Structures are given as C-alpha cells and as structure tokens.
Design a protein around this ligand. Structure first.
Ligand SMILES: CCCCCCCCCCCCCCCCCC(=O)OC[C@H](CO[C@@H]1O[C@H](CO[C@H]2O[C@H](CO)[C@H](O)[C@H](O)[C@H]2O)[C@H](O)[C@H](O)[C@H]1O)OC(=O)CCCCCCCCCCCCCCCCC
Ligand SMILES: CCCCCCCCCCCCCCCCCC(=O)OC[C@H](CO[C@@H]1O[C@H](CO[C@H]2O[C@H](CO)[C@H](O)[C@H](O)[C@H]2O)[C@H](O)[C@H](O)[C@H]1O)OC(=O)CCCCCCCCCCCCCCCCC
Ligand SMILES: CCCCCCCCCCCCCCCC(=O)OC[C@H](COP(=O)(O)OC[C@@H](O)CO)OC(=O)CCCCCCCCCCCCCCC
Ligand SMILES: CC1=C(/C=C/C(C)=C/C=C/C(C)=C/C=C/C=C(C)/C=C/C=C(C)/C=C/C2=C(C)CCCC2(C)C)C(C)(C)CCC1
Ligand code: SF4
Ligand code: SF4
Ligand code: SF4
Lengths: 189, 148, 55, 110, 200, 365, 393
C-alpha cells in the first residue's frame, strides 16, 4: 500500500518538474523578438510566381477565341464582328467578371501571342459587386509597385534570403536569391 | 484628440476638386464625409480602379457585357451615366453632390485633368480623390497636383 | 526608348536582378516590363532610370 | 419542428405570431414581405403580392408539409417580386445603410 | 417607361454633438469584435491571420465563438442551401449594429460552382446584406486586412441623428393552407435500432 | 499630518454643526477608491492582452492610441452602447438583476484591503469574514442567471460552474484560519503589523509555506483562471445568452475579483507596506522622524509602491501561469482540490497549533 | 422559461457550426447523464455535387474543381487525375518529373500531417502548439508561394505529359534548410509526449479498435497501421519509382489516440528521410547545373534527351480518351484515394466515381462514441482526422 503512495509522490514531483520546465520554456519564449509584420506599413514582396489580376491588351489581339475554351467557366467574352472590307474579324468589346474568377492562370499559358498578362494586384475591395465587369482600358492600367511607395517598408519572404536566414526581418546586406545565377558559371567554368 | 471644425466644406466649395491625404491604417475621412452630409451634401461611394473610361461612364451611356457560361447568348446591358442619373432624382434641398473615390493610387494623370474640367463644367457635383497619404491629414488642390 | 525592345533591370535593391523583359507601353515616366519565366507571363512595372537597353 | 424558408425578402413561417414569438402549428402560414430596408413599398403592389401569395397557396393543395414545397412557394413569390420590379413598378430606396443591387441594375430600354 | 428598375427619390448641427458622434464612431472603430464562421479552406486562411505571422489581433479584433457579442460576421466558404437558414438565424441572433464581410469567390457570387451546380448558393448577398465584398479564390490575408480597412472606412460614415435605420418593419399577413401533416424526421435511433441487430 | 482633521478644523472655522460636515467627507474617498479600481481594471486588461501577446511572440492591440492603452477604455465605452437583447422567456427583471446580484458583493468587498496605517477604509474586527461571506454570494446570482437564461446547455454549465465555485470555499477559509491563529486576530492591520515589525524574517510566507500554495490554488480556482468555465459541454458554460452590457459587467466583475485576490494574497502572506530594512533604523540614521512629514510622505509613497509592485507581480504570475499549465477537466480539478487542499490544510492547521503551543516566542503572543 | 427536469434520457443536439476547427456536422447525442449512449451524425451542408461537374468537362477544365475536392493537400487528386488518362491512353512519364511529383506529394503530406495535431492538442489541453505549428506551416506556405505561386490547393502544376513549370533557383537550398530545421521541431513535439502528466493516461483506452473489426469496417490510413496491419498502398503498388530508397512503416500495437499520434509523429520523420533521399537523388542536380550543361555543351550530345525535359510532349487541349474503365489507388494523408473513370471515346467522360477516404472511416465514429464521457467527444472526432469536404463532396 505504501508503494502506491511513493508512486503518487513520484508522479506529483514529476508533474511539478514538468510545470517548472513549462515555466522555464515560457520565460525562454519572451527573449525572442516578434516575427510579425505590420500592415499597411511592412508589405510583403510578391514573388515572380505569385499571380494576380489579368491584364489585357487591345493591340496584340486577333479575337481567335482559344482561351475561352480553356476556361472552365468561360469568363472572358469575345464581342467580334464580321467586316466585309477586310477578310478577318475585329474585337469590339472585352469584359470579364472577377467575382467568379478562380485565379489559377490557365488562360495565360495557352496563348501563343501572350495577349494576357499577370499583374501583381491583390488589393481588391469593393462595396458592390456589379462593377466587376472590368473593361479593357481599365485592365490596361499601370500596376502598383510596392517599391516606389515611400510609406511602406519592403520585406522579403522566407525563400528570398541570402545563404539561409530564419528570421528575415533585419536584412543588412543587399544579396538575394541564395545560390548562383546561371550566367557567371559560363564565365568562370 | 483633435476637435476639427468646418474647414473642408469651405475648401470644397471654393475649389472644384480636392485631394486629401489620409493614413491607410484605418479611417479618418469618414468624419469629413459625415460633416458633408451634416452640411447638406449627398455622398456617393465609388471605387477608382474599376471605372473603365471616365467619359463614356460619366457623360454618355455604356454597354456592359455580363459573363455568360455558354448557357445564355451574348447580351449587352445599357448602363446610363452614374452621376447624371444620381443628379436627376437627387434634391431634397438642392445644395450639392460629391463623388468619392476610395483607392486613387491606381490611376493615371491623364484623366485627372479631364475630371477637373468636368467638375468645373457642370457646377452641381464635386470630385474627391483619396491618396495613400503621409502621416498627417492634409488637403491639396487637384489642379495643382496635376500641374506639378 | 521604344515599345518593343529588350531591356534589362540592373538595380541591386530589387529581387529581379539582370532580367530581360519586353517593353509594353510608356506613360507618366513608367515602363511596363513583361517577364518570361516558365509558362506564365508576368508584368512588373519599373522606372525610366532603372532599366538599360540591351541589343 | 419549425418549418421556414427565407432568403432576404420573403418570410414564410409555419406558425402564428401571438405577441413577439411563434409556436409550432401546421394550420397557419404567416407571410412577411421585405423586412429589411431594401425596397420602398406601397399599398397596391403589396396587395397584388398578397393576392399572388393567396393564389400560390391555393394552388398547392393535397401535398405534404415539407421544406421543398414551401421553398418553392417562396421562390415563386420572389420571382413574382422580381417580375413586378421589372414591370415598371417600385424599386430601390436611397435611405439605407448599404446599397447592394441584388435583383438587378437600372438599365435603358432603348 | 423606357427606364427599367427605377430608383425613388428620398440643416445645422452642434460641435459637442459632433464630438460625441466622433467618440461613438471611434469606439466602434477601435473594438470591432468579429465572429469566426467558416466551413472550408477560407476558415484556414482566416485562422492563418490569428497566428503570430500577420497579427490580426493588433487591430482590436478578438476571436469569439459567440454569435451574440460580435458586431461583425465573416461568412466564408462554399454555402449549401441546407446551411442557408442556419446562416440566416446566425445573422438574426446577432445584435442590431452588425456588419457583413463576405470573403471568397464562391461566397460573394457563384464562384466555380456556377456552371453545373444544384446545391451551392450563388451569392451570399441573396441571404445577408453584404457591406464589403472580397473577391479571390482564395484571397490574400493582406486583402482581408484591406477589406477590414475598407470596412473601417465605411463604419465612420454613420450618423447619430440618422440612427433610425437599424430596424425591421412588421408588414404582417395571415392566410390559411391545405397541406397534409408530415411524419417526423429521425432524431437519433442509430445503434439500438430493431433492424440493426436483428437481420430481416 | 492629518487631512481629515484639517478639513474638520477648516469646516469648524467656516461654521457648521459638526454632523453634516462630517457626513459628506466619506463619499470623496469612497468614489476615489472606485475610480482607481476601474483604473486598475483598465490597467489589468491591457496588461493581460499584451502579456498574452508577448508569450505567444506577437504584439497586442495597436493603432488605437499611443500603444493601444485606450483599447480597454474603448471596449468599456463600446460595450455599453450595444443593443440589449433578450431571449424568448419570462422574468426580464430577474435576468437583468442576476448579474447585478453577481456584481454587488465583489465590488462591495473593497472596504477590507489596506494601503498603509491610515490609507484604508474599514478595519473593525473581522475583514476576512467580510471577504469570505461576501464572495460566497455569487453562486446565487449565477444560478439565478442560469434559471433566467432559458436554455438546456447554459443552465447545466451554470450548475457546473456553481458546483466548481462552492467547493473551493472551505480550504480558502482554512488557509485564512491558519494565519489568523498565528496572528491572534481577524483584522488585516494586526496581520500586516506582525509582519512589518521585523523585515524579511517576520514574513508569513516562510512560516506557512503550504498554506500559501493552498490559498493560491484556491484563488486560481475561484477566480476562474485555470478552470475554463466561460467547449463547455456544448459551446460555453454561462455564456451565449447575454448582450454586450451584461458581458461587460461579467468581464469587469471577473477582473475586479482577480485584482482583489491578487491584492489579498500578497496582503495576507507577503505583505504590502513593508521594507526589507526596518524603518526605525532609517529614521534614526536620517534625523528626527516623529512630526516631520517630508520623509513620512515619501515613506507612504514607498509603501504604496511596494503594494503596487506586489500586486503587479502576482497579476503577472497568475496570467503567466494561465497559459503555462495545461487545461485540466473540472472533475479532476474538484478531485485534486477535495483530495489535496483539505487534508494538508487540516494537518497544516494542526502543526500550526502545535508550533504555537510548543514555543510561543517567535509566534503571536 | 419551461425547464421540466424528468427521468427521461436527454438528447443533446450538437449544431453544425463547430467553431473551433471543424466544418459542418449535425451531431445528435442521446445520453442519460455523464456518459454517451447513442450518436447520430447528419451531413449535407457541404455537398456541392462534384460528380455532376465532370459530366461535361475536359481534363484542362477540371483541375481547380479536383483541387477543391479536398482542401488539405489537393495535389493527390490532381496526381490521380493526371494518372488516370495517361494510363487509359498509354502515355509515358519521365523520371525527373515523377521525382518532382513525389517531392511535392511528400511536401504536401508533411503539411497535411502538420494540420492534425493543432486542434487535437488544443481541444484537450494547453493552447500553445497553435502559433508555432501555424508558423511552421506558414514557412511551407511561403516556400510554395515562391515555388509555384500559391500556398495551397489553388495550384494546377500538373498535366497529362508532366509538369508545365520547373523549380526556382533557391528552392532546393531553402528545402535543405527546411529539412535542417524541421527535425528538432518534431523531436520537441515527441519529447512533449514521451514524458508527460495524465494526458498520456487520458487518451489511453478510449478507442480500443481491434484488428478484425477494423478489417470488417474497412479502415484505411493511419488507423490501419495503428491497428497493426501493414497495408501501406505505396508498398503494395509502386506508384512512381517507390522501390529505390529505404522505407520503414511505423506499426503500433494497440489502436488508440496516443498510438495514432505517435504513428504520424514518426511518419513526419519518415517523410523527412524520403525527401532527403530524393534530394540525394535527382539525376542531373539542380536547375543551375542543368542550365549550365545545356548552354555549355552541344545541342543534343548528351544532356538534352527524353528523360530530362520539362514535359516531353505537348498534349492537345481537347483530346479524346480511349473507351474503357480504369481504377488507380494512391495512399494519401488521410487514407486511400481512388478514381473509377469510364470513358466512351469522347471529350467529356461518362461516369466519374470518386472514392473518398474519410467517408469510409466516418462509419467507425458511431462505434467509437459509445460509453464515453462528454469531454472525449471532440477528441474522438479529432483523432480520426476527417474532413467535411471529403465526406460531403
Ligand atoms: C495592477 C493593479 C494596479 C492598481 C492601480 C494602480 C494605479 C492606481 C494607483 C493609485 C493609488 C492607489 C490608491 C491609493 C491608495 C488608496 C488611498 C485612499 O483611498 O486613501 C483614503 C484617503 C484618506 O486616507 C487617510 O485618511 C485619514 C483619515 O483616517 C481615518 O479614517 C480612515 C477611514 O477613511 C481610517 O479609519 C483611519 O483609521 C482613520 O484615522 C486622513 O484623512 C489621512 O490624511 C488620509 O491619508 O483619502 C484621501 O486621500 C482623501 C480624499 C480626497 C479628499 C481631498 C482632501 C480634502 C481637501 C483638503 C484640502 C485642505 C485645504 C485646506 C488646506 C489648509 C490651508 C492652510
Ligand atoms: C487634469 C486633471 C488633473 C487632476 C488633478 C488631481 C490632482 C490631485 C491628485 C493628484 C494625486 C497625485 C499627486 C501625488 C500625491 C501623493 C501625496 C501622498 O501620498 O501623500 C502622503 C500622505 C501621507 O499621509 C499621512 O501619512 C502619515 C505618515 O504615515 C506614513 O508613514 C508611516 C511611517 O511609519 C507609516 O508607514 C504609514 O503607513 C504611512 O502612511 C500618516 O500615515 C497620516 O495618517 C497620513 O495623513 O498621504 C495622504 O495624506 C493621502 C494622499 C493620497 C494620495 C494617493 C495618490 C497615490 C499617490 C500617487 C502615487 C505615488 C506616485 C508618486 C510618484 C513619484 C515617482 C517618483
Ligand atoms: C516565489 C513563489 C512561487 C510560488 C509559485 C507556486 C504557484 C504554483 C501553483 C500551481 C498552479 C497550478 C496547479 C496545477 C497542477 C496540476 O494541474 O497537476 C496536479 C497533478 C495532478 O496529477 P494527476 O491528475 O496524475 O493526479 C490525480 C491522479 O493521480 C488521480 O489518481 O499532481 C498534483 O496533484 C501535484 C500538485 C503539485 C503541484 C505543484 C505546484 C507548485 C509547483 C511550483 C513549485 C514552485 C517552487 C518555487 C520555488 C522558488
Ligand atoms: C523607488 C521608486 C520607484 C522604483 C520602482 C522599482 C525599482 C521597481 C522595480 C521592480 C520590478 C521590476 C518588479 C517586477 C517584477 C516582476 C516579475 C519579474 C515577475 C515575473 C516572474 C515570474 C512570475 C516567473 C516565475 C518563475 C517561477 C516562480 C519559477 C521559476 C521560473 C520563473 C522565474 C519563470 C518608482 C520609479 C516606481 C517611483 C516610486 C519610487
Ligand atoms: S487574349 Fe489571346 S486567346 Fe484570347 S482572344 Fe486574344 S489572342 Fe485569342
Ligand atoms: S484565371 Fe482561370 S478562371 Fe480566371 S479568367 Fe483565367 S481561365 Fe478563367
Ligand atoms: S473561394 Fe476558393 S478557397 Fe474559398 S471556399 Fe471557394 S474554393 Fe475554397
């Protein structure tokens, strides 16, 4: 009967030591700096693979209706007419809804004359949904650069740090893309 | 805090277009937007990135193409000018209208002079454009921002 | 510069270092640069003093 | 079991409002038209809506009390409301806190 | 008539009342207690903001599971019509100064389930009045913070004299039907069923 | 110095009847202690939020003021503006006055805690009775609000929270009894005087080490720090039925109980208004300290500072141990309480009586 | 208020909100006190009708839908829906493309195992693995956003011939840094449980799933390995050259929540070892060495061939599938994923039968919730690792 009492005392002192170790690691966790970012004061750097808005050009277009069949919902419409003076068709209007858009960038890939483009815009907040049918002259505007804005602070993500950084907040050097670009390898080696 | 008086209304009635610099962390233009309604102006929220062309949407009528899924045919919707139809059945007291653009950063400087001439052609509606701002609330003339 | 020529970005502060692009249009002293990486066509704008012409 | 089906404008409750609450009763269907400030109303179009509701509740006879038939009645009521809006009748009001065109946008006939 | 869906047509204040209205709006701007409602990966995108990488708490928003102490609901995910009266009751059980932020492409419109679908609800604006829409499939958390910023810009537009809009009119109507009584639905009765242990 | 005697002499020199002049003197400190209690509550809410942010490596509420210190004030100013909603039931006055019955005695028990020899309200005989018997009322208001809640789950959660709250009253009284036996008194003034006679060597934390831990565990179980009773059998225990006003009242009442417990634990065991070096040696080293108030004002400020750093240390330790120890069930909590704090408290009282009857030299005699 | 306490069993209706981490599920619990007698699950609040979507849809228009089937990893459904037509038509796959495929599949399996012990440890105790697990998953989010462009399922990345895109320049270096950093984080999570208070004794005998009952009920995934059955589907059928590295299947003796925890804890280290051996493989090295050997050497001499390419053959957007049925099996993070596809020489297929991994494992939940307490309900619901988008679909 006494062995159960000694086992209970051993479990109690082990639980007290576990509580003390939890207090020790909690006091250890107060030493490190916070690793969060501020908005809209410290905006993240968009990578070359991160997609966004779809930009449309009205000059390098032939109205061939190829990317409409690639889209599962067929959101870009082609308002093409037939002209009797020429032998081809011309585009009149170009509209696309963005509230039902998946943003997967599949119509941009199947394009030989690169008529669609990827634009680094994600800040889209509107009080009404009826204005989402964007016009071609509205999609032909200049994107907002995060570098040229003097009020924001540029900070890269985890995979854009030189030689391996676990925090990625100070960045005292100007190096990026840890590795080597494939241009100096042909010069030296 | 700062007990703001009635000074944005006089600067809006003196000029034709104004540009205010707000902090983008929260909201501070709502106080002036509420003071405009307290003075007797009807506010109209509108987004500046999605507008198409300013002339065909503000003076004349346009044609919107809804996104069809192949089930329906190609249809066109005749949209009237927004500020004209807002000015038609407007007035309870007939004082004035304002137009507020939320995100005025994604715009070019070519249509700003046309908007500043359009708000001076018809003396019934104003133009208020918002810029991302630098640490303080300040107002500037839009024609001086175009010319400089 | 003219729209339709190949330029190169040489800014050591930005992430895109020595990337060949295609100029789309010029307005307000800003140049739209179309990059060709992989199977997706991205368009990142820059300034007029940031790029250098490469024949 | 309190059977009901409401989206934004029609409220078909299978009970009876005594003072401010409802009790389960399969003998009375209470209709509430446009509870939120989204459309301004009158006394003639609301009477036409009530007559269409009486016609729709007189059409559905000899069927079980389920959610599907009540939702179909509410859908026919909202379709009647949308066709009354498209007919050239009352529409939106500029007095609410939020203005979202859920039924349609004002367009031009010609 | 030549105009489809027409719109019907619808002053001196004090400085102390204006300052009291600024204080009353600043309190709602500072507290902004949200509600966490999510049925899909948009709930995971919302929970990624609660973690210590984006710091969604620093604007004042604290996570609450109660649909009674939250002045803002955040609907998120693909909405089934069987969940639509649940969302209607969760919106109606909230207090009167409530706001709606709809996050996602399948929430604000039909999304990807708008071509061949018979169960997904094509738009939450048919259910609850959306104040700030948010396109994206899935949207960036910085875009959710931008929607929070636009909601904060929209809250300060309210007035203390035009406060008589947060109510619902009666418009009651009473009519009779001729439907048949239905048998009840199953409540439990899964394990100790007479057709489960005894094979028919 | 005596501000009350000088005010009485000034009102007598003005000309009064010595009764209505002395009647209205008490409401000014009676409201001053209330407003500094609300100040301490607004301190503790921001402190808990920022320390919970600093534990999990993030930043607390910002963009509301200089560093977000107005956010508890903004929360308390917003939650009184919300629409008071009521469920579909009867007894609306009972549902209103339930949280009032909860909020009255915990706020009422502010006449017990001292801040010095003169900086206190009431020290008649038995302030520990006026703490315990007034803190043992809130289960009645909890059960009243659970009955007026009209729910199947919230009533069961209120019953579970009341059964959790009433069980930790008996070791909370026995740990008070173990100190009141040694101090031969029930008032806090004699208890703090027997500790402030000497310096560190007269503290009750080194004389009764088991009773301090029992009292701390009972306080953490009573103020609902480790028991999560606010996933409570469907969603929450006594929640999901009120509005912003009643939830704000419950939140401020919980923070008042936390502040009052963090003050009372230090007062009964460690001792506010105390110094490691005795004040008589410093008064003999400086000069003559019997009528000169230039050092006495600084000594009173130092005693208030010692009480405030002890209260801040206990608050920080409680809200640090909230997220340190994991969550245990309420059945395991009641089992560990009734199987640990009562028998070791009884044998601690027995060994306290034995040590007092054996050598009555260093104890209270 | 009318609360009449009687001597009848109380029916507890758990609503379909579940506002901690769970989706939509209406649980009706019938009990008579401090136990659980009966439990009725009701679903139908997340069913979107995916089988009607694939009635008139091609392969290039079904990728976001099949990625939005399951919102945990998503790339397993993409991997089986690029494996079904390439086996129906007989189209080969390069070895480097399959290496990239298995690397991305194991890297999604790492995040899928990481999103189980968050709420499972949050609903039983202290809420501080939450922020660190979400930071460790946000590392994977930033890595995948730098690699492909998005953090989870909204990512096509797969065609019939192969992968249309390629890896970036620093992705292999940051992946090596992540394999350097991920191992002490899982040793800390195993040391959190190998010496513990009553957390070990709480979830120790609540499940008690036997072998023959698990075979008769049809359990597949980590529960079958916790029961003591070595039926890893990557060992039965070699999916994409799975017989080249070292393998070890963690097998537990008894079936409980602690055993199901430590099997996934060991499987994290096994996946780390598999991706480390995959980085030890890669016949041709990173993209820099491949580009240098392409631009330095000749045009078609030794490097540029058939095995080391982007895709190998550009498939048509509207291509015809041969007539016949097909079924493939792939071990996913939850269980076994299968697709029963029937084609009849047309662009749009006839029948798209989907085999969900969690809908077959949800049948044990009426058997598991019997004679247990109220606080064990959420732990039992979190231990099976089910998803409402997989059981509703
Ligand atoms: C993390 C948690 C954080 C917590 C929060 C921390 C931040 C907040 C910290 C703030 C400090 C906390 C509050 C301090 C402790 C409470 C002190 C108090 O309540 O203390 C209560 C005090 C009263 O206390 C003492 O009261 C004494 C009276 O005691 C008598 O009465 C007492 C009962 O009140 C006791 O019974 C005592 O035994 C008995 O002797 C005297 O008045 C002393 O002067 C006084 O110090 O109230 C007063 O201070 C008097 C009230 C103001 C009256 C104004 C004075 C009247 C004006 C006189 C002007 C004279 C003008 C003529 C000048 C002549 C010109 C020639
Ligand atoms: C725009 C809005 C403007 C607002 C305007 C409001 C202005 C008026 C409020 C301002 C208050 C802040 C100013 C500080 C005053 C502090 C005076 C003080 O402590 O006065 C001291 C006197 C001393 O009291 C007398 O003290 C005597 C000496 O005893 C003292 O000394 C003895 C030595 O053994 C014992 O220890 C005894 O316990 C101890 O009290 C006796 O006790 C007498 O009974 C008693 O009358 O207290 C008293 O009368 C009671 C005084 C109550 C003050 C309590 C406030 C809390 C103190 C501020 C917090 C400290 C901050 C200091 C910051 C410095 C940082 C470096
Ligand atoms: C300077 C002052 C420092 C004071 C700090 C002390 C406050 C800590 C009180 C703990 C609150 C939480 C209680 C939860 C405790 C908890 O949840 O687990 C309690 C745990 C229960 O274990 P089981 O459930 O296995 O036990 C019941 C079963 O055995 C049923 O058979 O064991 C105890 O009963 C032993 C209690 C020892 C508790 C020791 C507490 C003190 C540890 C720190 C000692 C510090 C010394 C400091 C020296 C400088
Ligand atoms: C003279 C004077 C003054 C000064 C002051 C001072 C000097 C103070 C300080 C002091 C301090 C500053 C204090 C504080 C403290 C706190 C703390 C610090 C706490 C925490 C801790 C904890 C709770 C922990 C725990 C534990 C245990 C118990 C076990 C082991 C481990 C550990 C340690 C973790 C002034 C200016 C005001 C003015 C008036 C006069
Ligand atoms: S954007 Fe491309 S695919 Fe679409 S119509 Fe123009 S040229 Fe054809
Ligand atoms: S990204 Fe996809 S959904 Fe959006 S327009 Fe392109 S093909 Fe259609
Ligand atoms: S919008 Fe995309 S991410 Fe959001 S619920 Fe729909 S499929 Fe999921």
């Amino acid at each position: 009967f006494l062995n159960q009492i000694t086992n209970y005392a051993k479990e109690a002192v082990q639980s007290a030591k576990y509580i003390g170790q939890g207090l020790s690691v909690t006091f250890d966790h107060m030493r490190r700096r916070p690793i969060t970012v501020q908005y809209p004061y410290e905006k993240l750097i968009p990578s070359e693979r991160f997609r966004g808005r779809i930009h449309f050009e009205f000059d390098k277009c032939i109205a061939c209706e190829v990317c409409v069949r690639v889209c599962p919902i067929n959101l870009p419409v082609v308002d093409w007419v037939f002209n009797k003076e020429l032998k081809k068709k011309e585009l009149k209007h170009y509209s696309i809804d963005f509230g039902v858009c998946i943003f997967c960038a599949n119509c941009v890939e199947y394009c030989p004359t690169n008529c669609l483009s990827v634009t680094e815009e994600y800040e889209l907040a509107t009080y009404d949904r009826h204005e989402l049918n964007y016009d071609s002259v509205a999609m032909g505007r200049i994107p907002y650069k995060v570098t040229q804005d003097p009020m924001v602070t540029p900070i890269r993500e985890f995979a854009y740090l030189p030689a391996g950084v676990m925090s990625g907040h100070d960045l005292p050097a100007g190096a990026q893309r840890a590795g080597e670009r494939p241009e100096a390898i042909a010069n030296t080696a | 805090g700062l007990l703001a008086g009635y000074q944005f209304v006089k600067d809006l009635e003196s000029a034709g277009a104004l540009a205010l610099f707000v902090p983008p962390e929260g909201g501070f233009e709502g106080r002036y937007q509420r003071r405009l309604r307290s003075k007797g102006y009807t506010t109209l929220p509108m987004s500046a990135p999605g507008l198409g062309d300013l002339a065909a949407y503000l003076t004349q009528e346009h044609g919107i193409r809804p996104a069809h899924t192949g089930k329906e045919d190609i249809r066109v919707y005749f949209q009237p000018p927004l500020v004209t139809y807002h000015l038609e059945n407007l007035p309870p007291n007939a004082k004035g209208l304002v137009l507020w653009l939320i995100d005025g950063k994604r715009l070019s400087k070519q249509e700003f002079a046309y908007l500043a001439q359009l708000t001076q052609t018809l003396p019934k509606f104003k133009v208020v454009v918002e810029v991302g701002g630098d640490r303080v609330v300040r107002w500037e003339p839009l024609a001086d921002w175009v010319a400089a | 510069i003219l729209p339709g020529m190949t330029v190169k970005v040489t800014n050591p502060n930005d992430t895109y270092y020595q990337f060949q692009g295609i100029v789309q249009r010029i307005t307000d002293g800003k140049v739209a640069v179309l990059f060709e990486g992989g199977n997706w066509d991205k368009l990142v704008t820059f300034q007029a003093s940031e790029l250098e012409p490469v024949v | 079991m309190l059977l009901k089906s409401t989206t934004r404008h029609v409220h078909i409750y299978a009970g009876h409002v005594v003072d401010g609450e409802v009790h389960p009763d399969t003998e009375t269907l209470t209709l509430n038209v446009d509870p939120d400030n989204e459309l301004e109303w009158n006394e003639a179009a609301l009477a036409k809506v009530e007559a269409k509701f009486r016609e729709l509740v007189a059409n559905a006879a000899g069927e079980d009390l389920t959610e599907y038939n009540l939702r179909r009645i509410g859908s026919d009521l909202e379709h009647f409301i949308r066709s009354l809006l498209m007919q050239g009748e009352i529409g939106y009001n500029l007095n609410s806190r939020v203005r979202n065109y859920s039924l349609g946008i004002p367009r031009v006939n010609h | 008539p030549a105009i489809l869906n027409p719109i019907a047509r619808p002053l001196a204040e004090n400085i102390i009342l204006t300052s009291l209205n600024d204080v009353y709006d600043w309190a709602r701007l500072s507290s902004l207690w949200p509600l966490m409602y999510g049925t899909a990966c948009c709930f995971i995108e919302f929970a990624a903001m609660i973690g210590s990488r984006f710091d969604f708490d620093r604007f004042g928003l604290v996570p609450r599971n109660s649909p009674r102490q939250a002045d803002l609901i955040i609907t998120s995910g693909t909405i089934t019509m069987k969940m639509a009266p649940a969302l209607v009751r969760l919106y109606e059980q909230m207090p009167s100064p409530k706001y709606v932020i709809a996050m996602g492409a399948c929430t604000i419109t039909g999304g990807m389930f708008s071509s061949d679908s018979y169960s997904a609800v094509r738009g939450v604006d048919k259910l609850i009045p959306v104040d700030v829409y948010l396109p994206g499939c899935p949207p960036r958390p910085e875009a959710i913070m931008d929607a929070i910023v636009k909601l904060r810009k929209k809250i300060a537009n309210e007035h203390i004299n035009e406060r008589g809009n947060l109510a619902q009119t009666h418009r009651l109507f009473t009519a009779k039907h001729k439907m048949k009584p239905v048998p009840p639905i199953l409540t439990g009765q899964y394990l100790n069923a007479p057709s489960r242990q005894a094979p028919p | 110095i005596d501000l009350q005697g000088q005010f009485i002499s000034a009102l007598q020199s003005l000309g009064l009847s010595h009764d209505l002049a002395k009647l209205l003197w008490l409401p000014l400190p009676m409201l001053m202690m209330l407003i500094v209690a609300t100040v301490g509550v607004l301190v503790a809410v921001w402190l808990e939020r920022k320390i919970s942010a600093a534990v999990q490596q993030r930043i607390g509420p910002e963009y509301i003021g200089p560093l977000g210190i107005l956010a508890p004030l903004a929360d308390g100013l917003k939650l009184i503006f919300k629409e008071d909603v009521l469920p579909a039931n009867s007894d609306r006055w009972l549902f209103t006055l339930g949280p009032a019955v909860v909020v009255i005695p915990v706020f009422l028990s502010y006449i017990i805690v001292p801040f010095g020899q003169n900086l206190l309200i009431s020290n008649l005989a038995m302030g520990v009775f006026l703490w315990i018997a007034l803190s043992s009322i809130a289960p009645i208001g909890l059960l009243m609000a659970g009955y007026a809640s009209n729910n199947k789950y919230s009533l069961l959660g209120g019953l579970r929270a009341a059964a959790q709250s009433i069980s930790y009253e008996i070791p909370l009284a026995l740990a008070v009894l173990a100190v009141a036996m040694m101090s031969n008194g029930l008032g806090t003034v004699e208890i703090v005087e027997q500790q402030s006679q000497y310096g560190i060597l007269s503290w009750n934390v080194w004389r009764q080490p088991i009773g301090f831990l029992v009292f701390w565990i009972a306080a953490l179980a009573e103020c609902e720090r480790l028991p999560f009773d606010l996933e409570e059998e469907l969603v929450a225990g006594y929640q999901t039925e009120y509005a912003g006003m009643k939830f704000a009242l419950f939140y401020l009442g919980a923070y008042v109980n936390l502040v009052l417990s963090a003050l009372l634990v230090s007062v009964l065991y460690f001792g506010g208004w105390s110094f490691p070096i005795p004040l008589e040696t410093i008064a003999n080293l400086l000069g003559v300290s019997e009528t000169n108030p230039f050092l006495q004002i600084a000594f009173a400020v130092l005693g208030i500072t010692m009480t405030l750093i002890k209260a801040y240390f206990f608050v920080f330790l409680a809200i640090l141990l909230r997220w340190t120890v994991p969550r245990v069930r309420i059945d395991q909590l009641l089992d560990l309480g009734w199987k640990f704090l009562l028998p070791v408290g009884l044998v601690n009282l027995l060994l306290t009586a034995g040590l007092k009857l054996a050598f009555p030299v260093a104890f209270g005699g | 208020p009318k609360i009449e306490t009687r001597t009848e069993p109380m029916v507890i209706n758990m609503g379909p909100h579940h506002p901690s981490m769970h989706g939509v599920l209406r649980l009706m619990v019938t009990l008579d006190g401090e136990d659980v007698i009966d439990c009725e699950p009701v679903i139908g609040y997340l069913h979107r009708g995916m089988e009607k979507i694939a009635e008139n849809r091609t392969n290039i228009m079904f990728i976001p839908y099949v990625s939005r089937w399951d919102y945990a990893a998503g790339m397993f459904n993409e991997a089986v829906t690029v494996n079904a037509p390439e086996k129906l038509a007989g189209i080969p796959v390069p070895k480097r493309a399959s290496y990239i495929r298995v690397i991305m599949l194991e890297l999604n399996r790492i995040a899928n195992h990481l999103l189980w012990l968050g709420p499972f440890l949050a609903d039983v105790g202290a809420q501080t693995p939450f922020f660190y697990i979400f930071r460790e998953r946000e590392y994977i989010y930033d890595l995948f956003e730098a690699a492909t462009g998005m953090r989870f399922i909204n990512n096509n990345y797969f065609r019939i011939g192969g992968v249309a895109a390629d890896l970036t320049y620093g992705w292999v270096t940051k992946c090596r840094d992540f394999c350097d950093y991920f191992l002490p984080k899982v040793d800390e999570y195993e040391r959190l449980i190998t010496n513990n208070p009553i957390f070990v004794r709480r979830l120790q005998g609540v499940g008690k799933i036997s072998r023959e009952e698990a075979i008769n009920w049809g359990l597949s995934g980590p529960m079958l390995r916790a029961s003591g059955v070595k039926w890893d589907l990557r060992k039965v059928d070699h999916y994409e050259c799975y017989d080249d590295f070292d393998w070890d299947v963690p097998v537990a003796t008894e079936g409980d929540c602690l055993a199901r925890y430590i099997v996934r804890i060991q499987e994290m280290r096994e996946s780390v070892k598999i991706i480390r051996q995959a980085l030890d493989g890669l016949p041709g090295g990173p993209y820099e060495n491949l580009e240098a050997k392409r631009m330095l050497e000749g045009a078609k001499s030794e490097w540029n061939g058939f095995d080391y390419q982007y895709i190998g053959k550009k498939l048509s957007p509207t291509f015809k599938i041969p007539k016949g049925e097909h079924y493939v099996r792939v071990e996913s993070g939850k269980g076994e994923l299968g697709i029963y596809l029937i084609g009849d020489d047309n662009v749009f297929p006839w029948r798209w039968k989907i085999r969900p991994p969690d809908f077959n494992n949800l049948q044990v939940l009426p058997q598991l919730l019997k004679g247990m307490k109220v606080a064990d309900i959420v732990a039992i619901l979190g231990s099976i690792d089910v998803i409402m988008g997989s059981v509703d679909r």
